[PDB]
Design goal:
Layout (H helix, E strand, L loop, with lengths): L3 H8 L11 H4 L12 E6 L2 E14 L2 E6 L8 E4 L5 E2 L3 H5 L16 H8 L26 E6 L2 E14 L2 E6 L8 E3 L6 E2 L3 H5 L3 E2 L12 H8 L22 E5 L7 E9 L3 E6 L8 E4 L5 E2 L3 H5 L18
Parallel strand pairs: 7-11
Antiparallel strand pairs: 1-2, 1-5, 2-3, 3-4, 6-7, 6-10, 7-8, 8-9, 12-13, 12-16, 13-14, 14-15
Length: about 325
């Protein structure tokens, strides 16, 4: 019944062209081969440096809800079937990574063969994963190198950072001597990373490692000598151009309060690399900023083509609504 074509006519609106999105955000013709109960491996979204055993708890369109084996369902999270943050069973052993075992298990008490027997489950087939450590690593970025990076949770801070992991085309940014939950995966084109010395050249304050002695006198040259680490070479940084989304363009976006849902959305405001999402019909109190390359924003039609339900605009004068 509800359709984009009719909505655009009614609203005299336009959609964000598919060309404004990354291919991975727009692709709708890939089949979602994941099935309920299949087991796999994946990073903990809120502790990116850690890998856990996950189970497919739900499948909806081109998305799936993952559950941390043995733990509370309150930790469940949603990803797209083309997510680079999940890997097939056996991936960590093959790539030298460590696994955080299922609840009740010691790292040594775990083995995929026995686990699958104990749980009477099957591992998601290898051919479904886009990231299996079979592709070329990020050019110029190696574990141990240092750089300057924006704390995306505290964006006014540009800090001393290190590459602590590399998986396929991406690397993990870590803030020196700070908690690992501030980490985030990145690629060479990220607008949040810069080469050593960027802050000095920009006249911007640089946040040194946590509790660095005499932090006011932090010196990169000295720090690199103290650690014996190399700076990521300047040539490796290849920042992406600003996006071209314009205010009022419509699209689809995953709901941030209940991730199971995807709603009709509008571009409320823009920055060089982020867009502010407004859910049609809802209060502006729910508007939120999100990176233009975030995997949870899609062009109009994505839900229909992938088989995922799309929430239409909230009705007028309803609770939590906006006369928009």
């Amino acid at each position: 019944c509800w359709s984009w074509e009719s909505y655009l006519e009614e609203q005299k609106a336009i959609t964000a062209p598919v060309s404004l999105f990354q291919d991975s955000q727009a692709v709708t013709h890939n089949k979602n081969g994941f099935k309920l109960g299949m087991k796999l491996e994946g990073i903990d979204p809120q502790h990116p440096s850690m890998y856990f055993i996950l189970t497919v708890a739900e499948v909806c369109g081109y998305r799936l809800r993952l559950h941390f084996d043995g733990y509370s369902e309150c930790h469940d999270f949603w990803v797209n079937a083309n997510s680079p943050d999940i890997h097939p069973a056996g991936w960590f052993e093959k790539t030298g990574h460590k696994l955080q075992p299922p609840k009740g298990y010691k790292e040594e008490e775990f083995s995929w063969s026995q686990y699958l027997r104990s749980t009477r489950a099957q591992a998601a087939p290898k051919h479904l994963f886009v990231s299996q450590s079979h592709s070329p690593p990020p050019l110029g970025f190696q574990v141990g190198m240092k750089l300057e990076a924006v704390d995306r949770m505290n964006p006014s801070l540009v800090c001393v950072a290190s590459v602590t992991d590399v998986v396929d085309s991406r690397f993990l940014v870590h803030f020196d001597n700070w908690d690992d939950t501030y980490d985030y995966w990145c690629d060479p084109s990220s607008p949040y990373i810069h080469p050593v010395g960027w802050c000095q050249k920009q006249g911007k304050p640089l946040t040194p490692p946590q509790d660095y002695p005499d932090p006011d006198n932090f010196c990169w040259e000295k720090y690199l000598e103290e650690t014996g680490a190399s700076a990521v070479p300047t040539w490796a940084f290849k920042v992406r151009p600003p996006h071209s989304f314009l205010v009022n363009m419509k699209l689809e976006a995953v709901d941030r309060r209940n991730p199971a849902l995807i709603r009709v959305a509008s571009v409320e405001d823009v920055e060089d690399h982020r867009i502010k999402i407004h859910f049609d019909g809802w209060s502006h109190g729910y508007d939120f900023w999100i990176d233009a390359d975030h995997p949870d924003i899609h062009p109009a039609g994505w839900c229909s083509k992938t088989g995922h339900p799309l929430q239409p605009p909230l009705g007028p004068r309803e609770p939590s609504s906006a006369v928009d």
